[PDB]
Amino acid sequence: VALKRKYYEEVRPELIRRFGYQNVWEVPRLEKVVINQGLILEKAAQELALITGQKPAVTRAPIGLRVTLRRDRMWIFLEKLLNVALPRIRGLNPNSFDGRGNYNLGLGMDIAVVTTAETDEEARALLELLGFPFR
Amino acid sequence: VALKRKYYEEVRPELIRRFGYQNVWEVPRLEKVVINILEKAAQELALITGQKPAVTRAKKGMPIGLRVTLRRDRMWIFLEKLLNVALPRIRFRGLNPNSFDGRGNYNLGLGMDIAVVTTAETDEEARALLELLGFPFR
RNA sequence: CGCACCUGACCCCAUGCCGAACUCAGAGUGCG
RNA sequence: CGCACCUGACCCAUGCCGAACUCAGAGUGCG
Numbered sequence: 001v002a003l004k005r006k007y008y009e010e011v012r013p014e015l016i017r018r019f020g021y022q023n024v025w026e027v028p029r030l031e032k033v034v035i036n037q038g039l040i041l042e043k044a045a046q047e048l049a050l051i052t053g054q055k056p057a058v059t060r061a062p063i064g065l066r067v068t069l070r071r072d073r074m075w076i077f078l079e080k081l082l083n084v085a086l087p088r089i090r091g092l093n094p095n096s097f098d099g100r101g102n103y104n105l106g107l108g109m110d111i112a113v114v115t116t117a118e119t120d121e122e123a124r125a126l127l128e129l130l131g132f133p134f135r
Numbered sequence: 136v137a138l139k140r141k142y143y144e145e146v147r148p149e150l151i152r153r154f155g156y157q158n159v160w161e162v163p164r165l166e167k168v169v170i171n172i173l174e175k176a177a178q179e180l181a182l183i184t185g186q187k188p189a190v191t192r193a194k195k196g197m198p199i200g201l202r203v204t205l206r207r208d209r210m211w212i213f214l215e216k217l218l219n220v221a222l223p224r225i226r227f228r229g230l231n232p233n234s235f236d237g238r239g240n241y242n243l244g245l246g247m248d249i250a251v252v253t254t255a256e257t258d259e260e261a262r263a264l265l266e267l268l269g270f271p272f273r
Numbered sequence: 274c275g276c277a278c279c280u281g282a283c284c285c286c287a288u289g290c291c292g293a294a295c296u297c298a299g300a301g302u303g304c305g
Numbered sequence: 306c307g308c309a310c311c312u313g314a315c316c317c318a319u320g321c322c323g324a325a326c327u328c329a330g331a332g333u334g335c336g
Contacts, residue, residue, distance in 0.1 A: 025238065025311090026256045032324075036276040038305080057321035064275070068322040098278050098303035100160065106305035112277040118161045120303095160279095167293075171308040171336080189290035191307070194328090200307060204291045236310050236334035244336045250309035 003082070003130065004075040011129040019122060028101070028117035028126045033074050036110045037065040052077055081111075082131055094134040097123055103132075136208055138215040138268065146267040153263060163239070163255035163264040168205045168214060171248045173198045183216070185209050217249075218269050229273030235261055241270075 007029070015027050037048050041062055048056045048065050053073050056065040069077050086092075096104050101117035104110070117123035128134055142164070150162050170184065171191075180188045184203050191200040205213050222230075225245070234242050239255035242248070255261035266272060 023257065032322080034277060034322095036305095038275060052321095055319095055321055057319095059276085066276080066321065068324075070322060070324065073322085093304090096304060100278055100302075102278060102303075104277060104304035106276090108275085108305050110276045110305055112304085114277075119158065167291080167309095169291095169309060184290095187288095187290055189288095193306090202290065202308065204293075206291060206293065209291085234334065238310055238333075240310055240334075242309065242335035246336050248308055248336045250335075252309070 001072070001075065001079075003079040004072070007130060011126065014129055015122075015125060018125060028115050028122050030074060030078075030126075031070070031114045031116055032112075033069045033077060034112040034114065035067045035069070035077075036112075038108045038110070039063050039065070041065075051080070078113075078130075082133070086133065091133045091135050094124065103127055136211040136215065138218070139208070139211040142211075142268065146264065149267055150260075150263060154260060163253050163260050165210060165214075165264075165268075166206075166252045166254055168210050169250040169252065170203045170205065170213075171200055171250070173201070176201055184213055214268075218271070221245075222271060227271075229271050232262065232272045241265055 012024065012027050012029075015021065016024075021027050035048070035052060036059070037044060037056070039062065041058070045056050045058070045065055048067065052067045052069060053076065054067045054069060056067050058064075059066050092105065097120035098104060099120060101115050101119055101123040103113040103115075103123060105113070113127065115123045115126055117126055124134075147159065147162050147164075150156065151159075156162050170180070173190070177188050177190075180201055180203060184205060186203050186205060186209055188201040188203045190198050191202055193199055230243060235258035236242060237258060239253050239257055239261040241251040241253075241261060243251075251265065253261050253264055255264055262272075
């Protein structure tokens, strides 16, 4: 919720000033965060459900658990990742963009942050201004 | 399909030159065309689109219209017929250039109503895409 | 070997229209 | 009143996700 507010109040106007977008709907915005937890199953699923607030799908060849977060579950999870999880580790790789505006992070737990930016450069600016700790 | 070829060979490079897009996937591109007794209207609409129309029913269940959402090659084939055959044979002043919805999509009615949905984010870019594809604006 | 992106529809499966979605398939981008 | 866009979440929905399907709501476009 706080992270979402930051998007509207702080990030979106700064993106407009930096890239010259003429309308608000053109500005890059997070679309979804996809979490895949590679691989008892019962326990892994309940933990992933607890941390995302969403029921995981079982991916079968059972080799994985997947959630697609959008809207407020997306923002709430991100806020947890940036404020709680990451700072308990011993910053993000700025080259890990897929060439089409999406960021990939592996922790194995793979996370895809999918944005509506069409370029890595704009996606980078969006995620940096949201407080993703790069470099 | 000739209209599709025209998009890739002629329209997309001209949009790149005019608006300065740095990558091909950023260039505006058609996403879909939505076309909105019953037996007869459905058979004709199916024949001209190559697709099965959905029946819109009152939210009573009496039929109040027919809709088809065309994507991909059925979209291009239908458009080519619309631009080359149907529109110029209207007993015709050209399409209204003010009928963009403010978000890059165009609407016209002939009643047969047609929604042309593009990935352009502004009316100005959508206008350029549809003009270069051969939409005949007045 | 997996997920995301990307591109498709012979194939299991699918649209109360649409391979959009769901399903399946395929050799490059990112990550593990 | 409908379709497209847009914004959401009592019928309904996701083999996860209001993405989709469903439903709802002033605005924009078009009937």
